[PDB]
Each structure stands twice: as structure tokens, then as C-alpha cells.
Amino acid sequence: GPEEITADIPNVGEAALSKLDESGIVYIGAEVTGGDILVGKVTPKGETQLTPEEKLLRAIFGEKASDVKDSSLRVPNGVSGTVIDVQVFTRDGVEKDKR
């Protein structure tokens, strides 16, 4: 499955998602510190059987199912500061244009 940017990073802290805008990428204008995650791509993961323990987990937690691996863009170590700009080039056949 395609890896798309929607800030739906599995096992993601709120403050981490509290920077990225809806399209996984974030908005424009403030700073960033440390290894802050910028764009949240989600790598598709393989499926499994009915998996009674995992079924119980989904009934308890759910919304993950070990299906989306966090492929998010994060700031580099020792890299922090203000942001100049962002640009998205989408191939023909994909017209997300979420932001």
C-alpha cells in the first residue's frame, strides 16, 4: 500500500502530532526544536489472521491493527531552527492537494 502523509503516525505522542498539519506536513511560520517530526507518512504493513489476542487488542485499543508503520518525516539530530518553505510535487494520477 502507498505511504501517505496524514499525521496518523502509529504510536505517536500528541505533541508530535501537535506540529504537523492535517496533510501530515505542518504549517508555516514558527520554529522547530530537536528531532521534531515534520511530515507523517504511513508505510503500509502486512495483514494477519483473525488473531484473537490482536483482535482483543483492537477491541481494546484498535485503530492501529499493526497496519500503518510510522514513516514520518522527523527533524534531524542536532538540527533545529526556523523554516524557509515547503513544496509538494505529486505525480499525475494522484491529486490529493490536501494542503
Binding site: I28, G29, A30, E31, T33, T82, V83, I84
Partner: protein, 229 residues
């Protein structure tokens, strides 16, 4: 002591609104230089003045983006304003707000200058708007401080604070930052020939010069005695 002839300040001159020159009665040699040194230190570095700590604009965030019409950007506006200084009362953490509409020259009259936010140099090059539809309104928190520091220092105190839009601003904070102490041999006729001291102090308006002289020499006495133990 032995006829110490403790002198007093005399003929303290103030040429302009942003400096002063204080003359003094004569004193001894081998000490006047050291005394002037200590005075300049305590007046310039540990100097209670005012600067800008926070900045903001609804359309202008931390990123260095030029405001509509305004020729200078956020960093550039910070630079152009930095060429001046602002006033807060005995209370610190005052706020000035430079807001203007039209296309005429940008100056400090259309800026928040209060009874606890005071302006003296009101015609700086402030990147006047060039588009008629523009109406600029930037707000700079002007507080009071003493010593030089960067902006990353306030990251810990403003982490859940300083959200996307609030600009945290730094300063170099030496509210005197210039004071010359000159010891010469004059103003002594009856007793031993003595050295009189002149202080050419200068500020950006943050504080009074003779006030800085009193503060610095009070610190001079204070740390001077501390050698007793």
C-alpha cells in the same frame, strides 16, 4: 584616611537626551583610574534598563516574512527597530505596539507610547507600507533587564508557551553600554595636587546618567567592602 578630602560630583553636563558628561572634584592618583574602571563596569554591564523581549503579529509569525507593504521582513523589522530604544516605567514588562495605515513614512508616533511606555526618537526607518490595502500592526513587548542574552534561553520557560505566532526576542542588555572614565591631575591647589575624574556616560534613553553614576558607585562601595573578610 589622613586628609582624604572626599570630593563630590560637580558640573555634571548633559549635552543631549541620550548621554551626559559629569565632572567631579579632584582625588588622588593610583586610585582614580581604578575607581573610574569600577564605576564604568557597574554602570554599563549590571545596568537596569529596558529592551524588547517578545514580538508578535497576527499575520506575521517567527518566520522572517515581510509584512504587507512593509519593505523590511520580520528579522529585518527587528533590525530596523533595534536601532532605537523604548521606555517602561519602574514596572518592567511594558509593551509598545507600532501600528500604521497608509503609505506614508513609518515612524514611532503610531506606536504604543504610554505613560509607562515612552518614546523619544519618533521617526525611525520603519519599512513604511507601500500597498494601500496594507495596515501594519506589530507588537513588541518592551521589558526591563540588565545583561546580554540570546533568545534560546527562554525556550524552557516558554515551551508550551511561545506557541506558533509568539516571537521570543533577545537582547544584549548593557543599559549604559558606554561610559568613559578619565582621571587627570587638576582641581587641587591648597593640598596635594589631585586627580579629578570625568564620566562621559551615554544611554539609548533607558535610564538617567547621574542615576547610573549613583548606582555604579554604590555597587563600588558594596563590593569594595567585601574584601574585608
Amino acid at each position: 584616611v589622613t586628609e582624604f578630602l572626599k570630593p563630590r560630583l560637580v558640573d555634571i553636563e548633559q549635552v543631549s537626551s541620550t548621554h551626559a558628561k559629569v565632572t567631579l572634584e579632584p582625588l588622588e592618583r593610583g586610585f582614580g583610574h581604578t575607581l573610574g574602571n569600577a564605576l564604568r563596569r557597574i554602570l554599563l554591564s549590571s545596568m537596569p534598563g529596558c529592551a524588547v523581549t517578545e514580538v508578535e503579529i497576527d499575520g506575521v509569525l517567527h518566520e522572517y516574512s515581510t509584512k504587507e507593504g512593509v519593505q523590511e521582513d520580520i528579522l529585518e523589522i527587528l533590525l530596523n527597530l533595534k536601532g532605537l530604544a523604548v521606555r517602561v516605567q519602574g514596572k518592567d514588562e511594558v509593551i509598545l505596539t507600532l501600528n500604521k495605515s497608509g503609505i506614508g513614512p513609518v515612524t514611532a508616533a503610531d506606536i504604543t507610547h504610554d505613560g509607562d511606555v515612552e518614546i523619544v526618537k519618533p521617526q525611525h526607518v520603519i519599512c513604511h507600507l507601500t500597498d494601500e490595502n496594507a495596515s501594519i500592526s506589530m507588537r513588541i513587548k518592551v521589558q526591563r533587564g540588565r545583561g546580554y542574552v540570546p533568545a534560546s534561553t527562554r525556550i524552557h520557560s516558554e515551551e508550551d508557551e511561545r506557541p506558533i505566532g509568539r516571537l521570543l526576542v533577545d537582547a544584549c542588555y548593557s543599559p549604559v553600554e558606554r561610559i568613559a572614565y578619565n582621571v587627570e591631575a587638576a582641581r587641587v591647589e591648597q593640598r596635594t595636587d589631585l586627580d579629578k575624574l570625568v564620566i562621559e556616560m551615554e544611554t539609548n534613553g533607558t535610564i538617567d546618567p547621574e542615576e547610573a553614576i549613583r548606582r555604579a558607585a554604590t555597587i563600588l562601595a558594596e563590593q569594595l567592602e567585601a574584601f574585608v573578610d
